[PDB]
């Protein structure tokens, strides 16, 4: 596992010793090389895991997330290359350093043999993204967004530290292998109920759960493109990964403690989707769609069945890729219009046809069209919920319907109709943006050919 | 062996060639509509044979060729059913589509 | 489509042709520059019916605000030429 | 449930198509009525008959749409039937193709639509099913004949009503060949397919005489009543439309309220509560 | 005399049937004149900014900015806890949750009772 | 937004808005691609009453026809080998109660 | 791929003899087919097997006794 | 159907209900009771594998018709005689069903007449 | 084909009746099939023979991995972690094996249904019975374990099943 | 010439590839390609075994 | 469309519009031409009876009952021309309309094609550049103080002067560009 | 290659209202003292080849004569060949 961590750490001296006009080239090249190296982790076993050492290990659940995290950084660099043109070399190096540190923290977070180390790195990731949002942010509300994003997560995660140290003092270890092998049932007690709440709330606040999702539209609107990319693709999956790992010790309490949350998601995935129908901002619309998808993932995790787990993993990967693509598209529009409103730039398919094709493919992926992995995860979770209770389908069906609607809404308002007359600074699309979209979309349709790589360890 | 399966899969296979050629040079000329129409007509006249074989005997087949994945006890594979309904509806649909595309080569000239 | 590119001469010829089919106005008295209310002594309802006939002849309908101030054949031909973008 | 849904679908769509004025909308409602009839066939447990009707409807409905589109292209993108008159002599091939397609659609015997629709009528009339559904499909067949007559009368028989500039022309080999291929199909394919496929259901060999011809009887009844009603438009009498007629024109007011009441009541909530 | 047309929220009264347009006073004419005057001033300024060859950007529309700000960020500072808002919020945010909870709890309890009683016929139910 | 004047030279012809004019709070609700409040030839209440009556009468008549069905003067269909017991389901080691059909 | 036909301006459009003869030929073919089929296959419309009248059947074959035995 | 009107406008008990038909023993009419015959056996019907609803008393003509259809394939209109025989056998089965319908109808008539006559005799 | 075992995937003789032309008209099916062989089946067979001989020029083998039986969870101490690990791995391998067994039975059932045609309801009773038995066994073994399934949970389920069976048997005997 | 090159490059090559793939790879595994059992009628003969189906029960033929 | 609107609608203009709309809907009702002509002359006969009415009160009371009666008998599916705001091809070609300014972004390789067109385009650009500078001053000196009272534009009055705000009216894409 | 032939219009005096239903229309109009102002405009609609109409039954019965003759010939040949 060190063969991935060490080059990521070496990315920092490379960036700081690079020429004043070559930082982007070397950063992108070596990030892509690190992604190629990390591709080896996909080789998994039907047995326990690949236990590299006493400190790190990999699984069929950590492997897709690690590969996605390593693949993200070149895309973030290409996205951030444009709007940082008038920046001093030292500050560009600081920005690249923040991105590299965030990737390193996520890489060592997703392996994490021991729960306290996982918590340490999972809380360490809060700093680079907070600095990115509050420093390289366009609007004056970036400070409030940073405060919200920091304090929601810290309030959720502070009881988790107490719960984890209490676990280590009682059972004796926090190593995940020993935790799984020496697992014992949880008695129905008030102490155990608060134990469950402390262990669960920290991850459920970052998914985000409906009603605890107020921070996400703010942190998405006020962040730069790289911040929105990283927080929509991987940083949302930290909560899902945490719940998937930690639920092994919460049984059989979860059978009846999950009821308040399931409802909050089952209704919430509807409500936010309806919110997407009436939105004047592209970024807010995509943020609310992300909230809906992550609510469905929460339902899948709380159901706690094999099909639920595989569907949740596939949905996490697919949602990350699609959300990053959509935010790239929105940022490309913003860099031309500088407005970030839906109704100003209209009829863009007349002006940018290939970008219209990219919009169509992104919307179709978000619409969960077969045989894309989005639909694979969605269908697996829907079937598992149907087995959980035959009535759930109703809500599920409604959400699916509404989903398609708003997706096509986002496709029709921005690309069809009559172009706005007074916007004439719509330059033809660069090769950089088109390459970014192609590198976003081709992995999705390639993963569609081999779903077993993203179906988790329960495949 | 058993040309039923080969021809039934060949019709669908050759129906997709102009989609792959959509990035080639023929897509940038005015001969593409005739190319697609000719491909459709060839597909129809090729598909006419399995229907004849069924009419003579009553041949029915399932072709499970590509195994997509396996989910515990469930197995999802690329399977085509070529019973009476399929081998009868394919020629009719291809004939109708050929007529429609020949008409559209006139209707949508501008 | 296969629609021939009609010209100003064609449009003026059609307008005068339909105007000559109007029995209420004399074929000899009418000119390309002849006014309806004063040079021909017509009514406002006559003008709106003439606009109706032009609309029916040429297949497109003129909005009321534009038609109410279309008082002479030459400006009718000019309006139709501007609307249909005919060169010569 | 399948039988009832098919019956309501076919009658509602035929009722709507009765008074429509756009040719494309009329043929769309005809297709919806045919689909409802196929669902009715599904309801009475006759799947192979429904498949056969699928095959026949393909042919004649495709030809009808092709002829309609040829007329629109010949009349400078004009779709309304009020502004199209005597095309029977101005464009003969389209007229004869539409006539043959309408005959096949209405169940003219020994044509493509005969071998399917006649057997549908026979089987629905000789099964333990709903009486309301049976009445519904009979009225639907009558209305099918009626709107086919409406199309022919208002599109080919009267005096021309298009703008003086005549651009009528069919002399294009592509259109002629495409129409004639499906025309040969709609003449012969029904007989060929019916005589070639193996038997798939127990036939109805013995029928009461009045029930045997009920399809033809309702067909000619619809033809005569529709022709009589369309003949009165020549009269110099102007009367305001009846309440029943208005209901038929606005498609039972289903598109209005169902596209105004629910959507609003959703979107407002999506802004207010959500 | 003919049957009256009753306008509704989703089907408004036609402009030709409004009695208000027939009640004409010099005040109404003055109001319409100043309405068209402000409309003409806005159109003049928009066209002046639009036809200038020097401009190569997006004409900033203050109305659009105001609409977006009012839709997004002007809600809470103008929000006051009232019995109407409190009651509507409590209903729309708590009622559906407890209703779905009751529905699903009843369904799952019935299913569990049937399973314990053994009368469910779960044959071939392998994937869950 | 649908019922606005279609002949005015708006700055935004598709949305039929003018630059600088106040924007409706629910503009995205009426964009001509969504709910519209244009006047209709028939009043709203009359249309609702007519459609509701038509559908309710249709459902009632379908239920009545279910109560009073239509059939033919025939007896039940006769199948040879004990209503085809062996080929319908099977269970060949049970010897069901034989059923013989009446020849007339 | 067709020929040149100019507009007419209130004059009936010229019709190529080819389309005339093709339309007439196909109408004649349709009518000939209908007539031939009705001649050869008349039972497809008028039926083949007569419908028996149940009331005309005698009580002997229907198992009816003269109302007294049982 | 007329029977529908006679049932739903007249006396419901006057006429039999096809759902529960037959309501009388088969020997109530006459003691002859000849048994209907089958030509095709189980194994050859299963090999011919017509359909479950097509495996009726007329299945031998259907088997012959399928043999003709498979044999003279190119001339799809050769073996018309066998279709005629199959249709004739179906027609015979249908008239047997109508004879059944009439027989139970008149048996119900005579049973009701017996109920009425016995009631009248008891009253007197 | 020797690529698979015939006994694991049993198939019927499927004898086919010889052609018996009744009329003199030549059926186009035979001409079409003969031209199909002449134009497709010969070059394909030639290329396959070429590829097969090329493969024969260089032959090498691969073997099926054998696994030794290890003590299971029922003979494992409470906190002894090594034998627990071995038992868990063995149980997981067994689980995969039973899943493949159920897969084989399901494939058999599907093939029977398609092969027997419209006599499937009577001609596939044996396969239906085998699938019912295997499904019941698999459901008893592995159902309701959860996402975090393990050997101890399966053992606990089996033990409570034996409790139920023993209590019912004692009650019936003492009834 | 265009029609011939079309029939070669658009029909013959795909059918060759499909025939090879189905004949030597798809059929290599069991139950992938499964066929409906051909109908058996009385009086037929079987190529594989050679036995003849006995005729039927000589039904009474009339009309 | 081209004509600037007025602050209000006169009674004469309103009655003309009612006549136009009623005649169109009657034509829609009476399909055949001769019947349409008969009922149209009848409509004109019932229309001009109150032509010579004098007082405003009765005239305003009229044209109101007429509007209500028309609303009741308005033929809920009228005939609409294909390019009309309700026709079958109202905005069919709006997807082929492309602004002129996009030609400023063409690659020099593409600009190599069509050289005469682009030379003329630069000539038009220079003409617009001068005429705009003239037009700003002409409009500010021409406008009444306190803002314009109507959206009507004055024409050019000098020799080399061009009409104010002409660029985006003259350079419309086309009616049917492709 | 398009339609550039310089088409010329007919003369306006050719169209005459008599002989068309517009005659009955103007007679009825004069019966109430009214007159059509646009009657001659649509007269071309009834003048040329459009002056002749076809009934619905005739339209349906478009090619029955030739088909009936062909059927007679075919059935005669069939009768003379089968009776051999
Ligand atoms: C349950 C479905 C709940 C309805 C969801 C509402 C979705 C809200 C947002 C939708 C966006 C709004 C929208 O699409 O605009 C309205 C749009 C435009 O109207 P037009 O008629 O096209 O006007 C064109 C002429 N100018 O119209 C629509 O498409 C709205 C359609 C909504 C349909 C809702 C009614 C559905 C009722 C279903 C009942 C039948 C149940 C199933 C029966 C089958 C038997 C088993
Ligand atoms: C093209 C020109 C080259 C011509 C030479 C090649 C001729 C054929 C020789 C190919 C040899 C056969 C081969 O490729 O190997 C079989 C190999 C399968 O590998 P296995 O491991 O045995 O099974 C899959 C599980 N691992 O088959 C193939 O890969 C090729 C055939 C696949 C079918 C085509 C798939 C196209 C559709 C893409 C997927 C669409 C989404 C999924 C659909 C879901 C449906 C439920
Ligand atoms: C978005 C903000 C969310 C913030 C997190 C919300 C969840 C809060 C979790 C509860 C807080 C305390 C957790 C304690 C850590 C777990 C350790 C544990 O469970 O051990 C228990 C100890 O349990 C406790 O002491 C918990 C007492 C709670 C004290 C603090 C109360 C905080 C507020 C509680 C209500 C809110 C919780 C849910 C909020 C939902 C989010 C809004 C047993 O200890 P013993 O005494 O040794 O065993 C007794 C037998 N000899
Ligand atoms: C099916 C549709 C039914 C609709 C029927 C509607 C009812 C129609 C009857 C309406 C009756 C009236 O006119 S209501 C009568 C209202 N009062 C007047 O008309 C008095 C002065 N008339 C004018 O000024 C006009 O414009 C005029 C002088 C005619 C023109 O003038 P010019 O041209 O010189 O400009």
UniProtKB/TrEMBL annotation, chain A:
It is found in: Mitochondrion membrane. Coiled coil: none annotated. Its main location: mitochondrion. One of its GO terms (cellular component) is mitochondrial membrane. Residues 1-109 form the NADH:ubiquinone oxidoreductase chain 4 N-terminal domain. Belongs to the complex I subunit 4 family. This is NADH-ubiquinone oxidoreductase chain 4. Residues 112-401 form the NADH:quinone oxidoreductase/Mrp antiporter transmembrane domain. Its EC number is 7.1.1.2. GO terms for molecular function: NADH dehydrogenase (ubiquinone) activity. InterPro entries: NADH4_N, NADH_Q_OxRdtase_chainM/4, NADH_UbQ_OxRdtase, ND/Mrp_TM. GO terms for biological process: ATP synthesis coupled electron transport. The gene is NADH4.
TrEMBL record, chain E:
It is a single-pass membrane protein. GO terms for cellular component: mitochondrial inner membrane; nucleoplasm; respiratory chain complex I. InterPro entries: NADH_UbQ_OxRdtase_NDUFB4_su. The keyword Mitochondrion applies. It comes from the Eukaryota. Keywords: Electron transport, Membrane, Mitochondrion, Mitochondrion inner membrane, Respiratory chain, Transmembrane, Transmembrane helix, Transport. It is found in: Mitochondrion inner membrane. Accessory subunit of the mitochondrial membrane respiratory chain NADH dehydrogenase (Complex I), that is believed not to be involved in catalysis. Complex I functions in the transfer of electrons from NADH to the respiratory chain. The immediate electron acceptor for the enzyme is believed to be ubiquinone. Complex I is composed of 45 different subunits. Belongs to the complex I NDUFB4 subunit family. This is NADH dehydrogenase [ubiquinone] 1 beta subcomplex subunit 4. The gene is NDUFB4.
From TrEMBL, chain G:
The keyword rRNA-binding does not apply. Coiled coil: none annotated. It is found in: Mitochondrion inner membrane. GO terms for cellular component: mitochondrial inner membrane; respiratory chain complex I. It is a peripheral membrane protein. Keywords: Electron transport, Membrane, Mitochondrion, Mitochondrion inner membrane, Respiratory chain, Transit peptide, Transport. Its main location: mitochondrion. Complex I is composed of 45 different subunits. Belongs to the complex I NDUFB2 subunit family. Accessory subunit of the mitochondrial membrane respiratory chain NADH dehydrogenase (Complex I), that is believed not to be involved in catalysis. Complex I functions in the transfer of electrons from NADH to the respiratory chain. The immediate electron acceptor for the enzyme is believed to be ubiquinone. This is NADH dehydrogenase [ubiquinone] 1 beta subcomplex subunit 2, mitochondrial. The gene is NDUFB2.
TrEMBL record, chain L:
It is found in: Mitochondrion inner membrane. The keyword Iron-sulfur does not apply. Keywords: Electron transport, Membrane, Mitochondrion, Mitochondrion inner membrane, Respiratory chain, Transmembrane, Transmembrane helix, Transport. It is a single-pass membrane protein. GO terms for cellular component: mitochondrial inner membrane. InterPro entries: NDUFB3. It comes from the Eukaryota. Its main location: mitochondrion. One of its GO terms (biological process) is electron transport chain. PANTHER family: NADH DEHYDROGENASE [UBIQUINONE] 1 BETA SUBCOMPLEX SUBUNIT 3, NADH-UBIQUINONE OXIDOREDUCTASE B12 SUBUNIT. Belongs to the complex I NDUFB3 subunit family. Accessory subunit of the mitochondrial membrane respiratory chain NADH dehydrogenase (Complex I), that is believed not to be involved in catalysis. Complex I functions in the transfer of electrons from NADH to the respiratory chain. The immediate electron acceptor for the enzyme is believed to be ubiquinone. This is NADH dehydrogenase [ubiquinone] 1 beta subcomplex subunit 3. It comes from Sus scrofa.
